[PDB]
Design a protein around this nucleic acid. Structure first.
Ligand code: FES
Ligand SMILES: [Mg+2]
Ligand SMILES: [Mg+2]
Ligand SMILES: [Mg+2]
Ligand SMILES: [Zn+2]
Lengths: 157, 161, 197, 37, 175, 84, 82
RNA sequence: CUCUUGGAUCAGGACAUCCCAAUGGUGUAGAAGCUAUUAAUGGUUCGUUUGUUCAACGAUUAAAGUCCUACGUGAUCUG
RNA sequence: UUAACCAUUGUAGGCCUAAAAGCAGCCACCAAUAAAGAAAGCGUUCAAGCUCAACAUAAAAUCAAAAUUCCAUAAUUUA
């Protein structure tokens, strides 16, 4: 971990970083997720795994540093958004530059939010019996996850 | 407009749809099969011979980083070196590494990082080589070997005298 | 180390004397239903347009194809041929049409060129046709047939349309047409189903 | 801001963005090229 | 700033093509053509001569000039009248191999920088392309009597060429 | 930018960004772009980490060590400082 | 506009001297030295068309140099239509 | 070869907007204009037939919008 | 199949085209150099000028799930 310090004269000092726990349960796995046998068994609720790929201000890290394959990178990125929108990462809020303050509005509780709350239109004309317009819940990218229910999960509510 | 199908016929189509089989393990996450050995095209072998000849024939090799001089200003340096019968050599970095790994010179690899150019001749006109370097001040010299002796820029200047 | 490799050569190609497309005269229902029996394979060139639906081509369509191809093609290095009959079926007579079936090559191009060069123009011409069509080549056309064979062999569904229809399981033939036994559920009206196995 | 069925880049400088639920092609050099879906 | 032109020494004043643009940069336009003309007096003239005039913020005239174009130089060597429009089957000058060597003994010395063009192949192949680019076929060797036989054919061929142009020109005038 | 000073030691295997940064600084278009700068290159043989020094006539001096700073940060700081 | 027409009339002079060589009005037209007085490689230049890719050896620069040009030719062919 | 609409009164509603309102581009100098996006808020005139196959004319207006509602509406009236 | 960096010359190739110079054509299409098409585009009255491909240096890796006033309530995992 390298921090740039300005004393104008500026310099950057490298510091030690904690290392991955030894003995991966499944060596020979190319991506870190595969190495630990977590391919289809994580969801937005799993902050402990997700936080490890998050910058101090909530951004995603680039693939090259993380080493994730394309498929897992997209999944983790999507799950992070839902974790932010669900208020599960309170200490990774955006930085306020000089005098900006949080809007101070009431917070509506959410979970499994696919889209950005700002830009979704209301459903003014809902449909009839089998012509109903559906309200999406969850993300399509996580379709293949392990399911403990008799029938596949209901994405459209 | 597609004519609607009797509900009984619709039920038949739903049950007879194609189903693909799925593998147990995805191929990408599995370890990769060994790649077939690459075949050396007739560029490295011909290039390989050229680098061997220039290193063996030329006693002195001076390595300098490429400074990307203009073509109009590049010509005069070649002409000045041509007047001194000194030649400029450049080769891809990839093909340069294997020889420096197994050759008379093996400690020059740290110098051989990034864009680099080689000054080769058959006579030790080092003073002219340094003199032609003084024409361009910004261009630095990383050193190299003269008369089969490895030395840096500071030693070459004193060697010229 | 940018790896150069030998370039493909067209030393085997020969350009016909009459490169350009000739003019089609204005003047000389199961026809468009079902699979094509004619002009289903590459004859002279390596590129062509492949229909995926049953439709009628009137004279206006022919000129649109002729002018577009003739304007762009270079006589020195390119040639084009007509792969379909001229309008012959009278419609009340107001105009004549040429029936087209799924799997019919409409126009075929060749010469000292690669598929990538002609993809854009052929696709543009195909979009304007009255039925859905896509530009294809010898390699691409063969791959589709090879893919179809693979799908049948590896299909994991124990029940298929053909077995049930022929054996009249459920008395299903009460609700079916004679053609269903032949087409085996891959054709419905004038429409071709690309994923039905 | 012509709204068109298919949005296509028209010059080298054209770039694409996803704002407020729709796809945009925006070119600073030529404001003529601005489009919405 | 390097500016390259092929203006001929015989005519020293193109004018609007050069003077204004150079004047826009800022130059002594009247001096430039006169300076070109006095150079024309010193050396041969009437032939397209490449130039490498340098224009700088200092506004210093530095003309660089030398031996003329290869094509015209070869035209005298091979007795070539000039280029022909077709250039596909057009044949004007056929010259000996030895003659090719001797003409280029000092011509290649006109290089702006002392290019080490030791192989004359580089020049002959360029001239082969140049001649073919012109209305010229360059054969290995031509006999003088063969030239006369072709010249009779060329005169008849040229006369027919003029008649074809006249018929087209007359038709265009009517249109 | 009135003056720009770059120093590095080749044979020691250490930061390379500086050498590439020197190449970018020692670029004909760049040297024309910041014409006011005087380009100077001095190779050294001691065991000293590369040091980049930018000197201004106004007296502001910007010293930059590639020891752990990447070439991108070198230019980024340089651009902002030139603005002031 | 006064492009010089065909010049000279003597085949022997054309093969033993060359009037057009002179580039100085003061300078005289040069005359040709003996054949033996020129190097052999000068007379051994390739008077035919350039060797094709088939003829050239795959391990020679000329073979690959033409291959590089052909690849550029192919790129332009593909780039033309876009 | 042929053969239900007007008006008065009172209006309910759609947006595919005529005016009023917020915006993007221009072959947008200003002033006029041409084109596109968003929005249904209230409004949207008075007289007249020589010729004109479901037309026209005079004077005005910020504007004199396009349509649906068994001619919207005759147990409210009328040609 | 790509994202990083770049560009010297025989000569402005002939051709009624003033000139049409890689680019109106029109046939040829060769040259040097490690590496550069008598040029894949723009753009110039023609020229200039901007790009592409080349120079070294890098990295990634096909189709599909409108007009009265919205109209059950809700819901992603227990074998
Ligand atoms: S998780 Fe191993 S490569 Fe995808
Ligand atoms: Mg109302
Ligand atoms: Mg609207
Ligand atoms: Mg009533
Ligand atoms: Zn644009």
């Amino acid at each position: 971990l390298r921090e740039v310090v300005k004393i104008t004269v500026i310099e950057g000092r490298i510091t030690e970083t904690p290392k991955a726990t030894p003995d991966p349960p499944n060596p020979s796995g190319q991506c870190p997720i595969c190495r630990w046998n977590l391919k289809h068994k994580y969801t937005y609720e799993d902050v402990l795994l997700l936080s490890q790929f998050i910058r101090p201000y909530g951004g995603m890290l680039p693939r090259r540093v993380t080493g994730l394959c394309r498929e897992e990178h997209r999944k983790i990125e999507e799950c992070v958004k839902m974790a932010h929108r669900a208020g599960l990462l309170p200490n990774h809020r955006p930085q306020l530059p000089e005098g900006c303050l949080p809007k101070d509005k009431p917070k509506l509780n959410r979970y499994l939010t696919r889209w950005a709350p700002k830009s979704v239109k209301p459903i003014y004309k809902k449909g009839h019996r089998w012509n109903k317009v559906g309200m999406a819940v969850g993300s399509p990218l996580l379709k293949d996850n392990v399911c403990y229910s008799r029938r596949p999960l209901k994405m459209m509510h | 407009h597609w004519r609607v199908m009797h509900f009984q016929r619709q039920k038949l189509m739903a049950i007879t749809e194609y189903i693909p089989p799925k593998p147990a393990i995805n191929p990408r996450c599995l370890p990769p099969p060994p790649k077939p050995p690459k075949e050396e095209s007739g560029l490295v072998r011909l290039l390989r011979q050229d680098i061997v000849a220039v290193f063996r024939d030329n006693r002195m090799i001076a390595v300098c980083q490429n400074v990307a001089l203009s073509a109009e200003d590049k010509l005069l340096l070649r002409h000045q070196l041509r007047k001194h019968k000194i030649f400029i050599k450049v080769f891809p970095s990839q093909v340069l590494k294997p020889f420096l790994e197994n050759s008379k010179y093996r400690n020059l690899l740290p110098l051989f990082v990034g864009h680099n150019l080689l000054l080769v001749s058959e006579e030790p006109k080092v003073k002219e080589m340094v003199r032609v370097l003084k024409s361009v001040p910004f261009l630095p010299l990383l050193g190299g070997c003269v008369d089969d002796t490895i030395l840096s820029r500071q030693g070459l200047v004193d060697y010229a005298k | 180390l940018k790896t150069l490799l030998p370039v493909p050569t067209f030393e085997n190609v020969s350009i016909p004397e009459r490169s350009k497309l000739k003019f089609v005269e204005r003047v000389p229902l199961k026809d468009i239903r079902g699979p094509s029996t004619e002009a289903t394979d590459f004859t002279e060139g390596n590129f062509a347009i492949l229909a995926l639906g049953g439709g009628y081509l009137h004279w206006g369509h022919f000129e649109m194809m002729r002018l577009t191809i003739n304007r762009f093609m270079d006589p020195k290095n390119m040639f084009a041929i007509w792969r379909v009959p001229a309008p012959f079926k009278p419609i009340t007579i107001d105009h004549y049409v040429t029936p087209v079936k799924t799997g019919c090559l409409v126009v075929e191009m060749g010469g000292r060129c690669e598929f990538e060069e002609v993809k854009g123009i052929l696709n543009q011409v195909a979009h304007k046709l009255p039925f859905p069509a896509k530009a294809v080549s010898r390699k691409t056309l063969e791959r589709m047939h090879q893919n179809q064979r693979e799908r049948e062999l590896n299909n994991q569904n124990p029940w298929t349309f053909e077995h049930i229809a022929t054996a009249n399981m459920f008395g299903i033939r009460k609700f079916l047409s004679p053609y269903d036994l032949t087409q085996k559920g891959r054709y419905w009206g004038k429409f071709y189903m690309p994923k039905r196995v | 801001f012509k709204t068109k069925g298919v949005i296509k880049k028209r010059c080298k400088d054209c770039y694409k963005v996803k704002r407020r639920g729709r796809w945009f092609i925006l070119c600073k050099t030529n404001p003529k090229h601005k489009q919405r879906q | 700033g390097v500016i390259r032109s092929i203006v001929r020494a015989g005519q020293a004043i193109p004018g609007p093509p050069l003077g204004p643009i150079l004047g826009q940069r800022g130059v002594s336009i009247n001096q430039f053509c006169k300076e070109f003309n006095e150079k024309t007096k010193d050396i041969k003239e009437g032939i397209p001569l490449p130039t490498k005039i340098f224009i700088k913020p200092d506004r210093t005239f530095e003309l660089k000039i030398g031996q003329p174009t290869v094509s015209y130089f070869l035209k005298a060597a091979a007795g070539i009248e000039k280029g022909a429009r077709h250039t596909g089957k057009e044949v004007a000058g056929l010259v000996s191999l030895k003659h090719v060597y001797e003409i280029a003994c000092v011509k290649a010395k006109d290089d702006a920088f002392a290019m080490q063009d030791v192989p004359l192949s580089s020049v002959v192949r360029s001239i082969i392309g140049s001649a073919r680019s012109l209305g010229i076929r360059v054969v290995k060797d031509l006999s003088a009597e063969e030239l006369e036989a072709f010249q009779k054919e060329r005169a008849v061929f040229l006369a027919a060429q003029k008649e074809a142009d006249l018929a087209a020109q007359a038709e265009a005038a009517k249109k | 930018v009135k003056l720009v000073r770059v120093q590095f030691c080749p044979f020691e295997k250490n930061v390379e960004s500086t050498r590439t940064f020197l190449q970018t600084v020692s670029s004909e278009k760049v040297r024309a772009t910041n014409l006011n700068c005087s380009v100077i290159a001095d190779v050294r043989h001691d065991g000293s980490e590369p040091c980049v020094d930018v000197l201004f006539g106004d007296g502001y001096r910007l010293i930059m060590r590639g020891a752990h700073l990447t070439t991108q940060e070198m230019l980024s700081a340089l651009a902002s400082h030139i603005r002031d | 506009a006064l492009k010089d027409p065909e010049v000279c009339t003597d085949p022997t002079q054309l093969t033993t001297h060359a009037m057009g060589v002179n580039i100085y009005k003061e300078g005289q037209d040069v005359a040709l030295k003996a054949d033996s007085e020129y190097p052999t490689w000068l007379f051994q230049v390739n008077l035919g068309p350039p060797k094709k890719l088939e003829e050239l050896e795959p391990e020679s620069r000329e073979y690959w140099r033409l291959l590089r040009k052909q690849n550029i030719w192919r790129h332009n062919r593909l780039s033309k239509n876009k």
